[PDB]
Amino acid sequence: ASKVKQDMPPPGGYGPIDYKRNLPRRGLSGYSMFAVGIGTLLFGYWSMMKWNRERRRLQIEDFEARIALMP
Amino acid sequence: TYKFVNMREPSMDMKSVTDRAAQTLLWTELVRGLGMTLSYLFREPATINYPFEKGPLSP
Numbered sequence: 001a002s003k004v005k006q007d008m009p010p011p012g013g014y015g016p017i018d019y020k021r022n023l024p025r026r027g028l029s030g031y032s033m034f035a036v037g038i039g040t041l042l043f044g045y046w047s048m049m050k051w052n053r054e055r056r057r058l059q060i061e062d063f064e065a066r067i068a069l070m071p
Numbered sequence: 072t073y074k075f076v077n078m079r080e081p082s083m084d085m086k087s088v089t090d091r092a093a094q095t096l097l098w099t100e101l102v103r104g105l106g107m108t109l110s111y112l113f114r115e116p117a118t119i120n121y122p123f124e125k126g127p128l129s130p
């Protein structure tokens with residue numbers, strides 16, 4: 001009557017199983033990274049130049065006010 | 072049949088040397104590990120709520 005029934009793989013087998021290493025490269029050359037670093041350094045230098053010159057002028061103005069008030 | 076696990080030779084041209092130096096001086100693989108841990112942070116944990124939840128068993 002009944003037939004044999006046990007754990008067997010399905011007909012046609014199972015699908016392929018990935019086993020190879022997969023470590024993809026994110027991707028950016030060293031030249032590009034160094035250029036980005038130097039560029040942001042230069043931008044910071046320029047902004048600091050302008051801001052510190054303005055600060056020098058402001059300090060000179062304050063010193064002038066003190067000089068006027070001194071006598 | 073046998074495989075070689077650590078039998079690679081780095082290329083000595085200027086571009087590859089610059090890439091290795093950039094990795095050394097900017098810590099690229101360290102940020103890669105940081106990013107993988109960050110990605111792992113944003114997924115569901117595997118913790119069940121014992122004793123209100125139970126692990127699977129068999130007959």
Ligand SMILES: CCCCCCCC/C=C\CCCCCCCC(=O)O[C@H](COC(=O)CCCCCCC/C=C/CCCCCCCC)COP(=O)(O)OCCN
Pocket residue numbers: 037038041095096097098101102105
């Ligand atoms: C044109 C004019 C420009 C003016 C000059 C500017 C030049 C700039 C270009 C070069 C500067 C880069 C230097 C920055 C620091 C470099 C230090 C370094 O590279 O040390 C590494 C090592 O550094 C480390 O490994 C430290 C890692 C510590 C583990 C924690 C990882 C930290 C990374 C997470 C993010 C860090 C966040 C930093 C910014 C935070 C700001 C709040 C070298 O060691 P080894 O690879 O083992 O080899 C030495 C033997 N030959």
